Amino acid sequence: HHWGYGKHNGPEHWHKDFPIAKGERQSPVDIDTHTAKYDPSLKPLSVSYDQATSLRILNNGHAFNVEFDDSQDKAVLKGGPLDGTYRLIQFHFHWGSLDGQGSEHTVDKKKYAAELHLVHWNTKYGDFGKAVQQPDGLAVLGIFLKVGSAKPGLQKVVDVLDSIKTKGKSADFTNFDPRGLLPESLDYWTYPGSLTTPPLLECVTWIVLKEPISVSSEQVLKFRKLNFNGEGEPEELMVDNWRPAQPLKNRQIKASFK
Ligand SMILES: N#Cc1ccc(-c2ccc(S(N)(=O)=O)cc2)cc1
Ligand SMILES: N#Cc1ccc(-c2ccc(S(N)(=O)=O)cc2)cc1
Ligand SMILES: [Zn+2]
């Protein structure tokens, strides 16, 4: 027993072990597209994933992470609101029990079927563990998923999920190209926030893409076959692993586009 997304250990409970849950820069938030400020001074995002090296896929009991070799500058995010260089460590998703919910960020209160998080750490801090302890330690690129046409670049991920059904299971996952998960446009909103799960540390520059990607009904259905539990423990489907929108408080969301 620990934090999760159930009746008894879900988002409304987290503050009791992680008091920063009620902090001043918590994520996710609703993106009010009409209050967001266009900043013509924001640089284009630079996503350089051509040399990415995926290693493994892991069911951690809260989601599944596709992990990368982050020991060199092989897959990096720069530009936009960011100073310096951020290294890709892993990506994961949050999703719903139904197509009408699943995203963590919302857009004018709209919820998408899922949300992809590509997690990067600021190389000036040397590694991920040190980066999460810093106010500008992480840059998370968030991408919304809507149900429609299939995303061919997602299919290799979908097909390996059968081998990591339960908490603690991992599988080799090499040569996966995260460029296949991106939409056409790199137009984005950006704001200062936090990890959306415990420990909820306020270490994230959020960069959320305006353009969702489309995935098929069958692709998201396969996410919903995963389990929160370990093998041989009672089966609970890994669904609705999203935190709802948190108060914006003293924050402005910026937009890269008019
Ligand atoms: N049986 C049982 C049982 C049910 C719920 C908990 C629990 C643990 C951690 C948290 S949290 N989210 O603060 O970390 C919340 C609830 C423990 C045991
Ligand atoms: N130890 C540890 C430890 C556990 C979990 C994370 C984490 C990373 C990204 C996110 S998110 N959903 O904001 O992209 C949430 C949590 C970091 C450190
Ligand atoms: Zn996430």
UniProtKB/Swiss-Prot annotation:
Fine-tunes the proton-transfer properties of H-64, annotated site positions: Y5, N60, N65
Effect noted on mutating L195A: Reduced CO(2) hydrase activity
Outcome reported for the amino acid change (mutating Y5F): Enhanced activity
Compartments where found: Cytoplasm; Cell membrane
One Pfam match: Carb_anhydrase
This enzyme's EC code(s): 4.2.1.1, 4.2.1.69
Effect of K16E: In Jogjakarta
GO CC aspect terms: apical part of cell; cytoplasm; cytosol; extracellular exosome; myelin sheath; plasma membrane
Effect of H117 to D/N/Q: Reduced activity
Residues that hold substrate according to the record: T196, T197
All residue ranges annotated as the Alpha-carbonic anhydrase domain in the record: 1-257
Activation and inhibition: Activated by X-ray, histamine, L-adrenaline, L- and D-phenylalanine, L- and D-histidine, L-His-OMe and beta-Ala-His (carnosine).
Reaction(s) this enzyme catalyzes, per UniProt: hydrogencarbonate + H(+) = CO2 + H2O; urea = cyanamide + H2O
Record keywords: Acetylation, Cell membrane, Cytoplasm, Disease variant, Lyase, Membrane, Metal-binding, Osteopetrosis, Phosphoprotein, Zinc
Phenotype for H62A: Reduced CO(2) hydrase activity, rescued by 4-methylimidazole (4-MI). Reduced proton transfer. Enhanced proton transfer. Enhanced proton transfer capacity
Cofactor-binding details, from the entry: Zinc. Can also use cobalt(II) with lower efficiency, but not copper(II), nickel(II) and manganese(II).
Keyword Lyase appears in the UniProt entry: yes
Annotated site residue numbers, Involved in the binding of some activators, including histamine and L-histidine: Q90
Cofactor(s) annotated in UniProt: Zn(2+); Co(2+)
Subunit-structure text: Interacts with SLC4A4. Interaction with SLC4A7 regulates SLC4A7 transporter activity. Interacts with SLC26A6 isoform 4 (via C-terminus cytoplasmic domain).
Function noted in UniProt: Catalyzes the reversible hydration of carbon dioxide. Can also hydrate cyanamide to urea. Stimulates the chloride-bicarbonate exchange activity of SLC26A6. Essential for bone resorption and osteoclast differentiation. Involved in the regulation of fluid secretion into the anterior chamber of the eye. Contributes to intracellular pH regulation in the duodenal upper villous epithelium during proton-coupled peptide absorption.
General remark: Target of drugs used in treatments against glaucoma disorder and breast cancer.
Protein name: Carbonic anhydrase 2
Natural source organism: Homo sapiens
